[PDB]
Design a binder for these strands. Structure first.
Length: 110
RNA sequence: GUGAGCCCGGGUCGAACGGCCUCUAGUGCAGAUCUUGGUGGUAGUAGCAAAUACUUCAAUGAGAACUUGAAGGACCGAAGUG
C-alpha cells in the first residue's frame, strides 16, 4: 500500500537510548542509534545522515545530546548501477519550534 | 641370521656403484643444563587498556576508523603538542 519512495517526520527519543552511556561515547552512540532507528522505520540497511543533522547531534559537545530530536526520513531509490540495495534512507534535521508534542507525520510529496 | 645386520619385491629417482682377500682410519651415539640447524604442545592463548575523542557527507580506490576536501566536536594553552 505504501510506495518505495516515501518521506515521514518522526520524533526520536534519544534520552532513553543514551541513558547510562559513557560520556566520551554518548554522541557517536547517538549517531548509531539514529541509524538503527532509520533502519527499523524504513527497512533500509543503507542510511545516510545529513551533515546538519550531525551538527545538531554534536551541538552541545560529545555528552550534550538533546533528549528529543525531530527528523525527516526519506526512503528513496538507489539509481546507481551495481548497487547492493535498491533503496536507501536519507535523514535530515527538521526546524521546529519544539520537538515535544508531535506525532509521526507523512511529508507531502509536492 | 640368536643378534649387530644381509638379501629381494614395489614406488620415487637420475650417474655411478658393489662382492671376495689383504691394507688403512678423523670408523658405529639417547643422553654430555652437549654443538649447529629445523620443528611442536602451550595457543588462535597471554595480550595489542598511560598521554581526555571522535562524528557526518563527498571524492579516490578492488578494498577506507586510522587517505583527502568540506562540515562539526575537542586537546596542547606561550616553562606549548608553537
Amino acid at each position: 500500500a505504501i510506495a518505495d519512495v516515501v518521506a515521514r517526520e518522526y520524533t526520536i527519543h534519544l534520552h532513553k537510548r543514551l541513558h547510562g552511556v559513557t560520556f566520551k561515547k554518548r554522541a557517536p552512540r547517538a549517531i548509531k542509534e539514529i541509524k538503527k532507528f532509520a533502519q527499523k522505520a524504513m527497512g533500509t540497511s543503507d542510511v545516510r545522515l545529513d551533515p546538519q543533522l550531525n551538527k545538531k547531534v554534536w551541538e552541545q559537545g560529545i555528552k550534550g545530546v538533546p533528549f528529543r530530536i525531530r527528523v525527516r526520513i526519506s526512503r528513496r531509490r538507489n539509481d546507481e548501477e551495481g548497487a547492493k540495495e535498491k533503496l536507501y534512507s536519507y535523514v535530515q534535521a527538521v526546524n521546529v519550534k519544539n520537538p515535544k508534542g508531535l506525532l509521526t507525520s507523512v511529508v507531502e510529496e509536492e
